[PDB]
Amino acid sequence: RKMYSCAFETTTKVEDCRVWAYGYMNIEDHSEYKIGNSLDEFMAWVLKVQADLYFHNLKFAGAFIINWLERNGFKWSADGLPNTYNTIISRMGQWYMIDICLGYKGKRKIHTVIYDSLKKLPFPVKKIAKDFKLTVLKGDIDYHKERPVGYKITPEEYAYIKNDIQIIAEALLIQFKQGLDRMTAGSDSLKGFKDIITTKKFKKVFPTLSLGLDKEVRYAYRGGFTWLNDRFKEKEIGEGMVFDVNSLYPAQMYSRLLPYGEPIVFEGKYVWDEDYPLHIQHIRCEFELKEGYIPTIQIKRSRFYKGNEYLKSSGGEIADLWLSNVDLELMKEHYDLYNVEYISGLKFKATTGLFKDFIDKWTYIKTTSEGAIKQLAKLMLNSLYGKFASNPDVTGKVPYLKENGALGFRLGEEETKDPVYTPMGVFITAWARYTTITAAQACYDRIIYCDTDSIHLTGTEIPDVIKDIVDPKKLGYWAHESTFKRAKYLRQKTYIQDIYMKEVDGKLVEGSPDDYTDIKFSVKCAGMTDKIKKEVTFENFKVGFSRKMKPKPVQVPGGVVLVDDTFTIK
Numbered sequence: 159r160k161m162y163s164c165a166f167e168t169t170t171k172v173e174d175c176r177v178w179a180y181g182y183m184n185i186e187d188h189s190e191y192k193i194g195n196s197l198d199e200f201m202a203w204v205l206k207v208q209a210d211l212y213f214h215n216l217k218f219a220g221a222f223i224i225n226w227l228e229r230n231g232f233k234w235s236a237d238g239l240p241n242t243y244n245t246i247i248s249r250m251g252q253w254y255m256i257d258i259c260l261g262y263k264g265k266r267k268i269h270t271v272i273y274d275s276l277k278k279l280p281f282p283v284k285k286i287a288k289d290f291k292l293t294v295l296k297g298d299i300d301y302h303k304e305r306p307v308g309y310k311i312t313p314e315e316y317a318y319i320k321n322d323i324q325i326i327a328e329a330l331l332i333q334f335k336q337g338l339d340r341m342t343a344g345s346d347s348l349k350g351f352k353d354i355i356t357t358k359k360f361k362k363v364f365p366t367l368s369l370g371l372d373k374e375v376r377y378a379y380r381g382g383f384t385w386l387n388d389r390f391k392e393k394e395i396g397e398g399m400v401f402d403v404n405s406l407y408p409a410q411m412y413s414r415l416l417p418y419g420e421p422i423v424f425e426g427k428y429v430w431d432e433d434y435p436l437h438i439q440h441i442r443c444e445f446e447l448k449e450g451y452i453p454t455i456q457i458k459r460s461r462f463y464k465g466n467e468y469l470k471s472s473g474g475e476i477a478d479l480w481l482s483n484v485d486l487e488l489m490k491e492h493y494d495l496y497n498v499e500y501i502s503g504l505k506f507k508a509t510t511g512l513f514k515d516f517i518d519k520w521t522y523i524k525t526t527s528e529g530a531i532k533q534l535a536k537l538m539l540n541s542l543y544g545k546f547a548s549n550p551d552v553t554g555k556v557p558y559l560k561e562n563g564a565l566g567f568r569l570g571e572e573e574t575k576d577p578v579y580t581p582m583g584v585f586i587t588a589w590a591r592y593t594t595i596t597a598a599q600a601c602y603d604r605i606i607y608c609d610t611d612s613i614h615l616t617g618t619e620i621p622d623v624i625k626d627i628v629d630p631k632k633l634g635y636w637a638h639e640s641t642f643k644r645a646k647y648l649r650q651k652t653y654i655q656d657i658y659m660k661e662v663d664g665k666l667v668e669g670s671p672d673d674y675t676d677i678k679f680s681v682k683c684a685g686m687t688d689k690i691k692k693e694v695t696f697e698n699f700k701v702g703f704s705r706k707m708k709p710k711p712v713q714v715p716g717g718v719v720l721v722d723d724t725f726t727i728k
């Protein structure tokens with residue numbers, strides 16, 4: 159089974175949308191490569207190679223391939239029948255795999271499978287080249303140039319195409335050579351962890367719970383603490399600083415008490431069991447936030463509450479929640495509780511050892527290393543957590559060739575994947591929350607904003623109460639990230655800042671209010687592109703700010719084209 163790195167270059171017209179150039183390069187032998195100007199020529203090769211092919215960002219390239227397949231006697235089927243293709247396309251419209259089936263010799267399936275290398279390496283090509291220390295050509299292909307059918311590729315364009323497939327070829331090979339061969343970064347991460355722990359032990363510490371338990375365990379899942387102090391809402395403020403936790407999640411995984419094994423179900427209020435020290439409690443009650451304390455509770459699926467705001471009060475109706483003991487302890491400290499009704503719960507065996515070996519291994523490699531290998535170490539540490547915190551829904555989109563020659567997608571069969579071990583998801587995030595909320599509270603008089611692993615504060619001095627836990631590099635510590643001259647927060651995840659910058663050898667880094675030469679303007683706003691951010695200033699950054707320069711994908715006959723769309727701050 160050979161592996162190839164692949165790329166297309168396409169036209170931008172709605173009416174005339176087609177591949178004008180392709181390239182493939184053997185990942186294991188970079189001297190074997192081909193660059194052509196015909197999709198038909200490439201697809202003929204696709205059907206012969208019986209190989210695994212990778213495109214960087216399949217979502218785009220894949221639309222051109224499916225368009226060809228449907229026009230050349232292929233149909234979509236999940237069964238893997240002769241002359242059919244299969245796909246993995248999520249509810250979110252992320253592409254994972256196109257599996258093109260030709261037939262069978264004996265029982266051995268004759269097929270070519272296409273994967274998205276962006277799930278292996280979640281970065282743009284240039285960003286990869288820069289970080290992995292790989293040769294990257296300056297500039298780009300001129301997209302404002304007319305290329306009729308049969309257009310001959312110039313030697314410079316040829317160079318650029320080759321460079322693209324090669325950067326990905328070089329990065330993927332380095333990865334496969336570490337033995338990281340799974341479809342996604344997270345899978346590689348899980349596989350590496352499993353190797354260390356042992357399948358035998360893994361199955362014992364992380365058993366598969368029934369769908370029913372799993373459903374109740376996930377009622378306790380909350381995510382990340384994201385909160386803006388009402389005091390600062392939509393106001394231009396002065397100097398402040400930002401702190402960031404060094405690897406918030408691996409930090410919890412490394413040292414916190416976490417659950418393992420089969421849970422034990424109990425009725426009523428939990429009583430302390432040292433063999434089962436962690437628990438989730440299904441509670442019911444009213445509450446009022448204490449004075450001088452940060453809001454903690456968010457009620458997800460209820461008739462009364464707003465799912466997004468952290469609640470100051472139960473509002474005169476009764477709150478029904480499932481809480482990890484970590485969350486419950488925190489709630490009790492921040493709220494007066496009233497009429498507490500203890501319904502039932504689950505208790506778990508707990509340890510702190512489960513992740514040390516895996517983190518140590520890759521933390522070592524990270525500091526020991528540089529370049530590509532350093533980047534892959536980071537991926538391994540940062541991709542594992544996600545695997546414990548995913549829902550079981552793996553329902554996909556089924557492509558079809560539309561009435562007018564474009565592509566359509568219909569939801570397929572409902573389908574469920576077994577979860578890895580959801581209680582681990584619950585507790586890693588609760589501990590994460592505790593880390594952030596705790597610090598933010600200790601700085602109540604200066605706290606502006608929280609976002610999962612960062613704290614935004616008034617003033618420029620490090621508060622005494624956290625000086626002992628501030629470090630530039632130590633795992634799980636708070637790092638003094640940046641300092642701003644002024645800022646404005648519209649709401650959660652919507653704000654702008656003027657960051658102090660200092661030049662250190664040509665390059666520009668974060669400076670202090672005394673030691674600085676420049677101001678870096680930074681914009682954070684959901685759905686806003688890098689291009690649009692450059693248009694934002696302090697004066698215009700308001701609800702209603704609108705620009706018609708957001709690319710939207712449009713399926714047309716032949717493939718996908720990007721078109722300009724109006725984006726507005728709601």
Ligand SMILES: [Pb+2]
Pocket residue numbers: 298299318319322
């Ligand atoms: Pb290019």
Ligand SMILES: [Pb+2]
Pocket residue numbers: 283318322
């Ligand atoms: Pb390029």
Ligand SMILES: [Pb+2]
Pocket residue numbers: 374423502
């Ligand atoms: Pb139950």
